[PDB]
Ligand binder design. Structure first.
Ligand SMILES: Cc1cc2nc3c(=O)[nH]c(=O)nc-3n(C[C@H](O)[C@H](O)[C@H](O)COP(=O)(O)OP(=O)(O)OC[C@H]3O[C@@H](n4cnc5c(N)ncnc54)[C@H](O)[C@@H]3O)c2cc1C
Ligand SMILES: Cc1cc2nc3c(=O)[nH]c(=O)nc-3n(C[C@H](O)[C@H](O)[C@H](O)COP(=O)(O)OP(=O)(O)OC[C@H]3O[C@@H](n4cnc5c(N)ncnc54)[C@H](O)[C@@H]3O)c2cc1C
Ligand SMILES: C/C=C\C=N/CCCC/N=C/C=C/C
Ligand SMILES: C/C=C\C=N\CCCC/N=C\C=C\C
Lengths: 496, 497
């Protein structure tokens, strides 16, 4: 009955569909489990109707990013604003010392650069370790050329990379930690606008929401059969599975009952199954802090508070005689606070004019914070200390809790918090995390190869976890969507 | 009659000194280091100036400290005796435009950020690409601007190309003369400023038999006697016969060998003549002219915020309008033309504020060709030099919370006490700074011809004969270790049963 059935209406699924229509292919479907399209691209609304991408927010690698370039064209043609280049000089804040960025004496950014260079040389990749292990090796080998404060603060500064992978430094693969940024980043002014434009480019009656596909079977007759949970069954010539990696991973697990899990028959070939042993998922999370208005310096749109550090750490590094001795010596034995991990804050006031902070968090904090997302009081109590330090470093004062408003003129030039928004990607069965990430010992290529090769001729895969360029990214998934559709598109046309 | 030696090293620069050090280390005896100049070190030279202040007028930094073998040795020494042999002086760059003033770490210009994109653009332009035409650095930057105009502000288009040019001071070549392919090269970590490169030269110089060193003997000719021997002639009339010779003279000096006219200082007459692969390699690699000017002041009465200061050459809003209106690369190249004297604002200049890194009240400035050749051609005219640089010096002082400079060469104001200039483009034993690439050059050719040698007995060492550390002091150092090791290996067969 159907030419192509696309499972998942995230950017990958949406582009594929868009591509099929664009190539004259008819009778296609887009089966999405959620009651909306967009997938991990979701723009939510908060205080005074302000909007925020709770999922993806930036166009990365703007030099080669095809999706971005496409958006660039549109903006060049209609003069409308679709994005803003918000890269900025990073402001680094330590609870005790305050700002430590661009410091004439700490020069942290410079040794951070040597650090990355150090990592590159290390894997040019005899045995992988965690990012934490690599930073410790660097400090030990280079301590002769590092001051005390550099040894203390640099390791905390370099962990901003945790916010790129969504994983604590002790959980992150050192080999995959440092990747090349192909140019500046462009903050999307509505990834929902990207979703809508693509979504509207194909037959609206093609979309089926709330269709949780439960099983996919390759009928030995040149036809694929798809069954959504409710009971509706379909048959198509080609199927493009774009469900996230974490969801697809349920398939290779026993006890088919998990929300989202699809039953493949025959099962996914071994090359696919094994791929999951060297892939894994990350948990980038988001907390939005909405204030009445801006009353703090807009020197930069990029701010990072560093986890607390100690002088005893420096002493231990200075005295350690070798890697092992350093390791155990570091073993020094609770309760997580906003200062237990680095936190990345986007000061939307400078880049968008909106008096709000978009904060990024990583596992294990993410899971914990998203778990208490309904408890605004606790949320404020948890982040209040880093929020106050930031305001102090930005020439302002302590934040006023106005989540339960009480108009008070006393709040002259005081920052007044009106709302807090939290992501929920780790508890959403259809996402179960943020995007593919590497634990030490992983090999991302495996999954790319297997996914791109597909289960077979009719069973294809798309998604941010199915491509090399832009892997884990919106544009990566977008392109993976075009890939599968164009391939199927050429195949149907050749049937002449 | 002509004395017999196992190995004769021509040149007591770092390659040659290391060669000798290695030979002795491996037990080779009866060797010789013949140096034309009356001192050792070559392009490693530390001079004295006002009040006995010391400055390296040639090489100054240990580059690529994460892997630099020469730096690691020095570091092992300091780690043991606690003596200070170097200082990590990397810092946040201060950028100064004549009209605008400081444009570094600017919340709106964000030049540093787009500069990073620029180098990435360059990387994507050549990185692992076969069949790509070269073009000049200047042209690469123009292309970037054109293709990214939509994502750059006017001020970024105006100032960015001028900041990018600090790379001219890494190559000693003006951006229009420089090969874009070879412009960007990775740095293996931070740089360490040597506090007496001459102390590095002396240690290596003292690590071998002191009677080996013959200064003031310029070598005139090298002859391969088809009897497995090499005859070497010093101009002082002495003749030597050696089983092996390691030639470490500068690439610019060796180039003289492929031309007629023997009475040129430094030129070596080769018989038989240098193989065609060597002669022809001189067409695929050239020589840059990094130069120096040391400005010594009475005392420090300026901000020590940073030790790294770069003055940007003048730029115009007209350029921006031209990038904006250009229809394509071909049009841009065209429009860019008009109808002129060279001043201190005609090219970027790099100033090391030694007051913060060493505590010495002096600026060490780097300059590039063609400016270097002109400035050295007037090194003797101190009043003229001061007038030429006075404006960039004044602007720097202004930006560092101080006042115009007072000529004190003959309480709150900076007083210039002395000006020192390099002489590399004029010294016939250097004839330039170091090997560099012109658009279309292929450095690999020379390295291959050099490391392979003229033949089994006639070898080459020097910054121009090796890949890792090419053009650098440690590259020259390693090249010397290379040839000496090879020779030790071969001479070792002598003791076999
Ligand atoms: C907090 C956060 C921030 C991010 N920031 C950025 C950024 O700045 N830049 C960037 O490039 N990327 C970013 N990303 C990653 C980016 O969002 C993803 O790469 C991209 O959206 C993945 O697209 P997709 O089409 O593969 O899947 P979409 O989620 O991403 O999901 C595929 C679809 O499958 C559906 N589905 C699942 N199971 C079933 C089923 N059984 N039946 C039917 N449908 C099903 C889902 O509901 C979903 O709509 C971020 C991610 C997170 C979590
Ligand atoms: C201004 C300037 C700044 C620099 N800064 C740095 C820096 O910061 N870091 C870095 O790593 N490098 C730097 N360099 C480069 C570095 O100095 C050289 O790579 C290195 O010193 C070259 O060593 P060499 O042994 O090959 O030659 P040395 O010049 O470099 O020359 C070999 C020797 O041959 C002798 N000779 C020549 N002809 C004859 C002859 N006919 N008979 C006998 N002897 C002869 C010469 O007098 C000389 O002593 C700089 C160079 C210049 C010019
Ligand atoms: C600026 C900080 C985070 C921006 N978003 C990052 C999105 C994911 C980029 N690719 C990550 C891949 C991880 C394996
Ligand atoms: C340190 C600032 C400028 C120049 N330093 C000297 C660099 C010498 C090596 N340059 C790189 C490659 C040369 C062939």
């Amino acid at each position: 009955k159907k030419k192509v059935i696309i499972i998942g209406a995230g950017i990958a699924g949406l582009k594929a569909a868009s591509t099929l229509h664009q190539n004259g292919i008819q009778d296609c479907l887009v089966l999405e489990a959620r009651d909306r399209v967009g997938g991990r691209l979701q723009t939510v609304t908060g205080y005074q109707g302000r909007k925020y991408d709770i999922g993806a927010s930036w166009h990365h690698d703007t030099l080669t990013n095809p999706l971005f370039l496409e958006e660039a064209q549109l903006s060049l043609n209609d003069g409308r604003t679709r994005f803003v280049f918000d890269d900025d000089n990073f402001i680094y804040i330590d609870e005790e010392r305050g700002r430590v960025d661009h410091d004439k004496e700490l020069l942290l950014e410079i040794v951070d650069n040597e650090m990355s260079k150090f990592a590159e040389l290390e894997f040019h990749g005899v045995s992988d370790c965690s990012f934490f292990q690599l930073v410790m090796k660097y400090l030990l080998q280079r301590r002769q050329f590092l001051t005390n404060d550099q040894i203390r603060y640099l390791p905390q500064l370099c962990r901003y990379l945790e916010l790129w992978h969504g994983l604590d430094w002790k959980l992150l693969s050192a080999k995959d930690t440092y990747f090349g940024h192909q140019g500046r980043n462009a903050f999307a002014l509505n990834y929902d606008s990207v979703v809508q434009r693509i979504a509207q480019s194909f037959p609206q009656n093609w979309l089926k929401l709330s269709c949780e596909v439960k099983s996919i079977t390759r009928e030995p007759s040149k036809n694929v059969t798809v069954n959504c949970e409710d009971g509706t069954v379909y048959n198509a010539d080609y199927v493009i599975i774009t469900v996230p990696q974490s969801v697809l991973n349920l398939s290779v697990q026993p006890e088919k009952n998990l929300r989202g899990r699809i039953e493949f028959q025959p099962p996914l070939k071994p090359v696919i199954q094994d791929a999951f042993d060297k892939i894994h998922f990350g948990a980038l999370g988001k907390v939005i802090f909405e204030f009445e208005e801006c009353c703090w310096s807009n020197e930069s749109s990029k701010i990072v508070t560093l986890a607390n550090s100690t002088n005893e750490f420096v002493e231990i590094v200075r005295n350690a005689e070798n890697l092992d001795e350093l390791d155990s010596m570091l073993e020094r034995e609770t309760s997580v606070t906003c200062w237990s991990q680095p936190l990345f804050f986007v000061n939307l006031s400078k880049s968008t004019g909106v008096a709000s902070f978009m904060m990024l968090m990583q596992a294990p904090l993410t899971n914990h914070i998203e778990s208490i997302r309904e408890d605004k009081e606790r949320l404020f109590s948890f982040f209040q200390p880093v929020l106050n330090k930031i305001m102090k470093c930005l020439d302002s004062e302590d934040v006023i809790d106005g989540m339960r408003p009480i108009e008070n003129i006393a709040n002259a030039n005081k920052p007044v918090l009106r709302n807090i928004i939290v992501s929920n990607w780790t508890r959403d069965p259809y996402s179960r995390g943020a995007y593919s990430a590497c634990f030490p010992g992983d090999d991302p290529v495996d999954m790319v190869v297997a996914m791109s090769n597909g289960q077979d001729s009719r069973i294809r895969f798309a998604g941010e976890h199915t491509i090399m360029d832009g892997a884990g990214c919106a544009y990566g998934a977008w392109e993976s969507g075009r890939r599968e559709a164009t391939r199927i598109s050429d195949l149907l046309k050749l049937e002449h």
